[PDB]
Design a protein around this nucleic acid. Structure first.
Lengths: 168, 177
RNA sequence: GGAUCACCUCC
């Protein structure tokens, strides 16, 4: 429901004020975060608009998170090249996993809310990254998922991962 | 560039030199059909055989990059474009077997093909799969059941089974319907 | 039939 302190997130700039911006988090639907003017760049920022446009997509670090109040603070300056690159790879792999899962759902006649609840959530909890679950299944057999997801998902998840996810 | 950085899916393969001509096609028509039919963008290096397949803003099928990539490999492993286009059907996959991993090579090829390609044709008819024999690989298009039947028969022929028992094997599997 | 075949060929 909320990201963790130190997590990198994809976010979209929604509003810009003189000393900060509000962003919506792409991976946490409807969750908004603040980005203070002092976290926008490693040099001094005179005008935020020199760095942010409404609608712009950004990788940002989570610097403060208060779940009881639902406050989230982000920083753009603290993200390194390497961290941007990793997060972006990880985001693109989450789009694959989701597409793979939508396909398995269509094949099995389950709606997407079910696929999320029966496959996505538990796989994310356990491997940290759903694509990683799939990578394990590709390397060692679909049985690695046995126990985490309903048995009826195994045959079709098996066909899809075997044909679409490379062993690392 | 926002899209490039956050959404573009890209795959990279390398097909043998003498299949490059076929992938491109007269006036680029073949590459253009793959592009059209998958809404992807395909880049071919005429010298080295490297191919790049990427999504576009227009791309509508989320798995399309992978389908295009597979058609590229099929063409690379001996299928004609027409035959490789089978891979656009739902639930049909490409499987590439390395002969050298089973086994003399030229001989095994000729046992799979059979006199006048009778063996290949019987395997295709009985398994329901498409088969291309080319260089050091045999490539199969079909659904997983079709693939497993052809795969097994081909492996039997490589490991030295007489043709008779292979056909009888195929006869057995079809009869399981 | 008794084990090499057919189609596709530089954007």
């Amino acid at each position: 429901e909320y990201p963790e302190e130190g997590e990198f997130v994809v976010a979209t700039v929604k509003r810009i004020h003189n000393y900060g911006a509000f962003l919506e988090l792409d991976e946490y639907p409807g969750k908004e975060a603040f980005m203070h003017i002092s976290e926008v760049a490693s040099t001094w920022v005179r005008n935020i608009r020199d760095y942010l446009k409404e609608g712009q997509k950004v990788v940002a670090k989570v610097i403060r998170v208060d779940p009881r109040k639902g406050h989230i603070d982000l920083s753009l300056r603290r993200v390194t090249q390497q961290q941007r690159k990793a997060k972006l790879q990880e985001f693109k792999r989450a789009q694959k996993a989701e597409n793979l899962l939508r396909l398995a759902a269509e094949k099995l006649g389950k709606d997407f809310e079910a696929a999320w609840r029966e496959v996505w959530v538990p796989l994310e909890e356990e491997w940290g990254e759903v694509y990683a679950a799939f990578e394990d299944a590709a390397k060692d057999g679909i049985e690695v998922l046995k126990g985490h997801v309903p048995d009826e998902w195994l045959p079709v998840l098996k066909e899809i991962v075997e044909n679409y996810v490379e062993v690392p | 560039d926002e899209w490039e950085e956050f959404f573009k899916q890209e795959e990279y393969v390398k097909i043998p030199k003498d299949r490059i001509a076929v992938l491109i096609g007269k006036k680029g028509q073949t590459k253009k059909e793959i592009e059209k039919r998958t809404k992807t963008k395909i880049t071919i290096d005429s010298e080295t055989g490297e191919v790049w397949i990427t999504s576009t803003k227009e791309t509508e099928d989320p798995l399309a990059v992978w389908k295009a990539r597979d058609i590229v490999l099929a063409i690379g492993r001996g299928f004609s474009p027409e035959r490789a286009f089978r891979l656009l059907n739902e639930g049909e996959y490409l499987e590439i077997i390395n002969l050298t991993d089973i086994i003399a090579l030229p001989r095994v090829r000729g046992r799979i093909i059979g006199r006048k390609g009778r063996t290949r044709q019987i395997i295709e008819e009985m398994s329901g799969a498409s088969v291309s024999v080319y260089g050091k690989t045999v490539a199969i298009i079909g659904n997983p059941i079709q693939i497993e039947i052809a795969k097994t028969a081909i492996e039997k022929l490589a490991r030295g089974s007489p043709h008779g028992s292979v056909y009888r094997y195929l006869e057995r599997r079809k009869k399981d319907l």
